[PDB]
Design a binder for this molecule. Structure first.
Ligand SMILES: [Mg+2]
Ligand SMILES: [Mg+2]
Lengths: 251, 251, 251, 251
């Protein structure tokens, strides 16, 4: 409680699944939150389900939209004050090998998963540096930033890019005394309403050869490690990878 | 607050520096703690400085002493109840290259840093498995588990051994549904009264070529990530490495 | 000698520095080589300096040009036979932090360093699979695929993407018994005529805090590890990272 | 051919399997070799099967025997000249979880796999430094230096220790301009007469969930990467990990 007192957070893809859980715990801990998403009717209902407009609001945004990132920071500023916290959580996945990826699939996945993260990090540094905010940029990666999957080629590429680009930004902010930290969070398989919509998916994911615990995780498993990284508890952590994956990458 | 409600923790080397901070935060969050150390007068005073005997007690133990590990678990059991949490934090360091390490230095450093951790992990699994405790074994490693240091040969070996042996134990517990998690924590350079006792040490450690933040950390920086791993917030994390190092291993 | 007997290799960016050394050793060991580059006068002179047209030829190509990759494989096929070996070595670097990267710099660097590698790998698999060739795709990464550099943001992102996308492709080829291997090579700082053109560069690179050997390497240091990976000596290596960096990433 | 001209190599555990293949290729490439082993009748027959006493000889040694390491270097010196190359390849394995490891199993496995490597590396540096030899210490690790196995607890610990202790030694030698390199080699599952002696072993090892290639490797797969590291081709590689594992650690 009150672990995120005074923080102002943006969370991209914050209307569903992982990102909505992070938003929920960020509010329980005293943060003010702006969540983004592509659809207004889902996003306004999501934001109302968590709290009141003095706590959490919704902004319609495609994270691949460069100019929209500026509007998003302005609106959060106008609504809640200077932003201290950015969680680049919006992503999309394509189920193709490298061999079978079309160039339109490639470009479309990188625009969201890699350009978007770049645009959010670049603008985050510019807007949060040198303000005594205890600023933190949590860049959502995944186990596929560590290990390959034969059927997630373009995804593997985007999550490996975000893993190492985040270490570049972390160093620059640390060396220039910007008072910004940058870290990546790497979920394993997490249960979400989307997974529930794929018969047998969670079953395949829960096999011991994939997830040693024999089950998959839940959205709050990721929300709790983002709380830690958003708060001043983690003021000495930057450039690091935080894995919550049920044992996946240990074997 | 109350993030560690009901937990029973042992912390080795818990009378000083990092381990005493972990003990302190473990008590603030509702855990019952037994700290160990080699000297009674320091350990009884340390334990009294944190709280009352219903909260925290001291047990005299050298972590390289196999038979003493049994006494330690029994006494914690008798005092506080079944143990749910073990932090293998006791260690010693030798400032020698591999070339200049004597065999007595080698054996003496491995008895504490590697045998001790083994004895604590082995007995932890045996005593905590299959009890619905939400058991967690936090094995203290360090950045020297990732990267070499020309003047910490035997240390590098012990912290690399603990890094990978902890992943073995994590898998076995996960696959056998033991309800035990095992993880490693890797501090960078941390300020402790011992460091303060070395003129110019912290100065050398704080140089940007070592620690990009330009400063070193503090004991609570490690206590907060142990709280996270001791609690049920991290129930989906096992076999993973958690680095709090100011950027050291990012460059 | 004759370690690359019968192999047919494409090497992108093969007219200069690292890529020209790889081409040279590939020819000394019995491979037939096609090198690419952006300028005909340099590329025709480079190719003539190594050997005769029955051994090595030049093809004008920008690796970011998708359609040109098809022409390149056809022409190599027509000239030398079925391709067994692809070295995605062409790259460009931008000396900017993430904070100071413009979007045109970002896109331009990713088109060469990441799209290009994708196009070469995707087409390599399609053209080399299932032909008993002992096919090998060596994807040129660098130490910046492992660690961040505060002034190479977009570069770090491209080399982290190539590191993990190569593991995806390696698995798919292995699981489908394609007889293709995919691996990444990670040079540290290497002396090239370009570096010689930056007064004080090599001096800054050779400092012990960067390169522990106190010097930087030479192009042949990378050519010898590509020989190993192009040949059947490495038929059990796939999805792995091979680092030749003077100690850079060890500390 | 002649890639190891003038080199003088010791290979521990060099009478069988992996180590005997390394010895064989080291001789084919012009090196003089001393192999060690615990049994004279196997070791003298092995050494005779490779070549004549001017090329390769056998020395009876337990690598856990400190004082014997001195005799071994002296005898190689007397027989072949100053040693340039050490391959710490002798090891033993115990098939137990951390939970089920007895302390005698623990100590016995660490004496060979970790003390032995220490003794060989420490004495190697002392005897090979500053002699213009192009000295190379190849420390045999394995995939279990990267990832855990639920039934190889003490093994995981020894191979993680050797992975990181080798980086310490590599840095010290590089910084002091000793003309010694230190690297680790990490085989995956390799077919040896011992494996052939376990019905169904290779079958279990060759499953795609373990080894993506669907088969295991052969001893020469490790011999060829040791050739590369023993020779001056790799003069810019130190502190690095070289993995030949069929894809095991890529997924
Ligand atoms: Mg480093
Ligand atoms: Mg794995």
């Amino acid at each position: 409680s009150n672990r995120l007192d005074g923080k102002v957070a943006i969370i991209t893809g914050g209307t569903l699944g992982i990102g909505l859980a992070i938003a929920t715990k960020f509010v329980e801990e005293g943060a003010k939150v702006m969540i983004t998403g592509r659809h207004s009717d889902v996003g306004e209902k999501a934001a109302k389900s968590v709290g009141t407009p003095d706590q959490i609001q919704f902004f319609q945004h495609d994270s691949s939209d460069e100019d929209g990132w500026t509007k998003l920071f302005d609106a959060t500023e106008k609504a809640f004050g200077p932003v201290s916290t950015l969680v680049n959580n919006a992503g999309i996945a394509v189920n193709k090998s490298v061999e079978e990826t079309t160039t339109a699939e490639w470009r479309k996945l990188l625009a969201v998963n890699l350009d978007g993260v770049f645009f959010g990090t670049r603008l985050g540094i510019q807007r949060m540096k040198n303000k005594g905010l205890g600023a933190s940029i949590i860049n959502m990666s995944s186990i596929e930033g560590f290990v390959g999957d034969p059927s997630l080629g373009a995804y593997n590429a985007s999550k490996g890019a975000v893993r190492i680009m985040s270490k570049s930004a972390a160093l620059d902010c640390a060396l220039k005394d910007y008072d910004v930290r940058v870290n990546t969070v790497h979920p394993g398989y997490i249960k979400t309403p989307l997974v529930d919509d794929l018969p047998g998916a969670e079953e395949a994911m829960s096999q011991r050869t994939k997830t040693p615990m024999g089950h998959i995780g839940e959205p709050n498993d990721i929300a709790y490690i983002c709380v830690y990284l958003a708060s001043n508890e983690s003021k000495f952590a930057t450039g690091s990878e935080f894995v919550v994956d049920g044992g996946y990458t240990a074997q």
